Symmetry: D2
Subunit: 251 residues, 4 copies
């Protein structure tokens, strides 16, 4: 029987490339999405045309609130309802926008989005994933290779991604006895934000030593595929940078 | 109005009390923030005001994450400006610490609001308030944890909160540097052990520490805070000083 | 000449042997570098050449630091171009590992030459020789690092200095060689094959500390991360070190 | 009664500032130098004019070689001969120049100089300090930028990473003897004499806190803290003194 994976924020960009590649490797996939319902259903349709009954969608807002734990329970439950099993969780969904310390949404909305999506939802998904266990079980967290050299005015985003490093280590430690590995993939610059102009995109591109270009979504997905694979069966608590050398470049 | 002034969160007992005492001894006026420890906070302010009149005030606030945390953090900073006319130093010391197992009577969302609210979100909001309200020597010191990469079993949310606080330390150092506000951390290993911890378990930890097989005093933690706020650290920002007796170098 | 070629140092036994086997399985021709283990090196080359003729050679060299180490490292890279007409991958695996207490029959200058030469200087000189030779391709270097260098064994200062220096080489060489398309990465085992000396009970002390399975990594599990880093699946990865340590480095004292 | 300190490469720049501030704190000092004989004797004269019999100079080459161990033993012995004790070792001397991987010193000389001064000599000085043994400690001058290194400085960067390794390993091993071992990691402090003014300003503009390099005295302040009674539970720590430079992305 084919294993099953949940990918959060899988309708577009990097999470889509991860779900496509897990699907190409033989997984059945839950395509989680928040707002991108058309893109989500479309991808599931494509994957189901390739092999029948192998993809479902699941809608959830991963903002922090008193119902986030139930929404995280439901995402995991949807994998067991569809596939009877849940072998892999990829924490990919993320909010990303500036929160300047010196002066739009209220500050507690910014905290709920940037800490909720980037850190607390991964924690609750990890709890739900682990508790539902009755094989090569793992979790991969999408981290950020530049968290020690952050973008100016992104403190809450940075705080959430440092927290996700902490979860990666703490959950690896705690879930090792259950045979669940927990690792991360840390892109530098990959698919640039859609709102970004080409000129600004090129400023970032020119900083990358290996090829002066951003990672493709497939290149990020390749490292996720490695970490879920049997070739990573002794790896837990590791974060693999996939950044073309960007984090080595001084100011 | 010539003496500088400091806010210390969770200043009634243990490490925050030692910090407040040592800043006061260095010549600071101090705000002693407390949540539940009113009697101890006031007892410390009485002690400091006897030494030097009108140099210590108390400020009550809960630092749990909520819709009101922003107002509570604004009020802590405001209380320093009201009392003393200025606020030179913020010490983010208050902290919740307890296990949160992944495989399982506070709701999980309450555990979040305390372990992430109190240890990371409150420092972030206090930082925004402190910065907004600004030969000055302005700085923030965050109480971090030297064992963040080799954490205690079943302490995920606490670990998450202390990693978030490293992220705040670095991001705020970068962004506030133009304002001349330095932002640094002090990372204890084992210092005063939790009051709830058993004696045998305390000794198990002390035996691990390379440097003298004992925990740090609160005053040893405070000494690193005093260095970082001083004129001898005026080029230091974004730095976290471990004060752990070598504990974090010891393999399993 | 369509098959790529790889140099693996210290490849006669244990982890380097497993790396040379997996690279060969992947379609690489291999130079099996050895120092003292000639019989084991030759035996591996004969096994590999039985599988596919003319795909494995051995190369003997001492990688201790000295006046002649630069010429030795140049000769190891040259051996790969003479055997196979190309050198696509260098794996810096050879290593000396023994205690060097700070407080009290090798002299300390011999200890320095062996521990810093094998773990750090020889990798640097091999890296220089590999790059100088390179002026469809997927050129990369993988350095065998150590996941425990921040929580080191007592009295191993020179060993730990050499492995920290190797992290620095991995980063500096990644940045400097990225314009030539040469990626430079590391694999950091925690406990893998335990040193031949140790008795089952002492091996068992270390095994019991590993969260993931309470056992050491096989040599092949370490090799698997090397295979990933040299592969087309890692073509944007440079300057990275992959721990393969079962969670050991997360475990407090 | 006054404690004594060895500072390597103490004739000029940051090591000089460290020697001065230790002396101002009450220490007797060995001013180690290699080539800067006039500047070393001149500083010793200035310190002894302030307090007689409190400064000596000691000449040694800290390039790696089969005689480096004897030179490092001699530097520690010079402190005991002058002052009868040695409480503090500051590993400050350092070669710094590029060593490109792709192409008038031989590569074997560049390895001996950059790995010997930045790493091997500190190790042997540590061994000699420990063996010859109050608030004993060693401070290693590290580099805040070693994970974001200058292009073509691989051997320098290898030496400074090795010095982090030594700081940790010796802190662990010497803790039972009460010897603390810590580091201070400048970002940009006093820029190299040979560097042109235009390049100096390029580096200054990158520093978030003040858009200026650290003074030698600001670096020495962090050394004074780590040797002080206010750092008695600190060992294996490296303090960055870099004005935020290491936080700044490309
Ligand atoms: N892209 C890069 O250069 C880069 C660099 C470093 C790290 N990363 C990390 O790599 C991962 C993938 O990057 P990306 O560029 O593909 O991410 P992205 O496009 O910014 O976000 C991916 C998805 O996250 C989901 N999301 C956002 N807010 C949400 C909420 N409140 N609830 C539920 N879902 C939410 C969205 O789903 P809907 O569209 O369905 O609403 C969005 O499409 C992220 O974790 C990111 O931080 C990326
Ligand atoms: N003790 C150690 O060995 C050690 C080790 C590593 C790191 N640290 C760090 O060092 C710092 C000080 O440690 P410590 O042992 O002195 O801390 P602690 O005793 O656990 O807590 C300090 C104070 O924090 C306040 N606090 C807790 N929850 C709060 C909430 N919801 N709102 C407002 N205040 C709250 C409490 O004040 P009230 O009493 O007024 O309610 C408490 O007295 C902490 O940040 C800690 O994580 C300590
Ligand atoms: N095994 C582990 O648990 C572990 C843990 C952490 C890191 N690592 C790292 O992973 C790599 C492989 O580990 P391993 O256990 O397989 O290594 P190993 O057996 O200790 O050493 C590998 C080979 O290194 C060669 N070597 C030693 N000194 C040499 C010199 N002076 N000149 C030339 N070659 C020399 C020897 O070759 P000859 O036999 O031909 O003389 C030896 O067989 C090493 O870099 C090690 O530091 C291993
Ligand atoms: N300046 C900065 O911006 C900066 C930045 C990062 C880290 N650091 C570190 O901080 C420390 C002090 O910096 P600095 O700029 O003051 O250093 P420096 O001026 O470059 O060097 C200090 C002294 O080291 C001695 N030295 C060099 N080669 C030697 C050899 N073969 N044998 C013995 N001594 C030798 C020289 O002594 P003589 O003059 O007597 O020959 C030299 O004056 C160094 O460890 C450096 O790596 C400095
Ligand atoms: N959720 C998301 N996180 C990031 C982080 C960095 C980047 S690349 C950039 F914008 F240059 F920093 C894009 C995204 S989208
Ligand atoms: N708020 C607090 N945080 C910590 C972290 C560690 C410790 S020492 C211990 F408990 F051994 F890990 C005590 C406290 S109290
Ligand atoms: N060359 C070598 N390096 C190491 C490092 C660790 C280990 S595992 C051990 F010994 F438990 F630390 C074996 C070796 S063999
Ligand atoms: N021995 C020495 N090491 C360094 C490291 C950096 C610097 S600052 C510079 F050069 F901008 F990198 C000067 C020196 S002098």
């Amino acid at each position: 029987e084919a294993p099953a994976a949940v990918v959060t924020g899988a309708a577009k960009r990097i999470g889509r490339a991860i779900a496509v590649k897990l699907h190409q490797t033989g997984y059945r996939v839950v395509i989680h999405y928040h707002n991108s319902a058309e893109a989500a259903v479309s991808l599931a349709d494509e994957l189901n045309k390739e092999r029948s009954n192998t993809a479902v969608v699941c809608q959830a807002d991963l903002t922090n609130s008193n119902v986030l734990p139930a929404s995280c329970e439901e995402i995991i439950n949807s994998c067991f309802r569809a596939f009877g099993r849940c072998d892999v969780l990829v924490n990919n969904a993320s909010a990303f926008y500036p929160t300047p310390l010196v002066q739009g949404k209220t500050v507690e909305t910014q905290v709920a989005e940037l800490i909720g999506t980037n850190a607390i939802a991964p924690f609750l998904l990890t709890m739900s994933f682990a508790q539902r266990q009755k094989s090569n079980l793992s979790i991969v967290n999408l981290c950020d290779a530049m968290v020690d050299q952050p973008c100016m005015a992104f403190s809450l985003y940075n705080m959430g991604k440092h927290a996700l490093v902490g979860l990666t280590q703490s959950a690896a430690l705690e879930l090792a006895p259950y045979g669940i590995r927990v690792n991360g993939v840390a892109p530098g610059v990959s698919l640039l934000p859609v709102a970004m102009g080409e000129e600004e995109k090129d400023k970032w591109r020119r900083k990358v030593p290996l090829g002066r270009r951003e990672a493709s979504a497939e290149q990020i997905a390749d490292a996720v595929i490695f970490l879920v694979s049997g070739s990573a069966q002794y790896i837990t608590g590791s974060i693999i940078k996939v950044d073309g050398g960007l984090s080595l470049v001084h100011a």
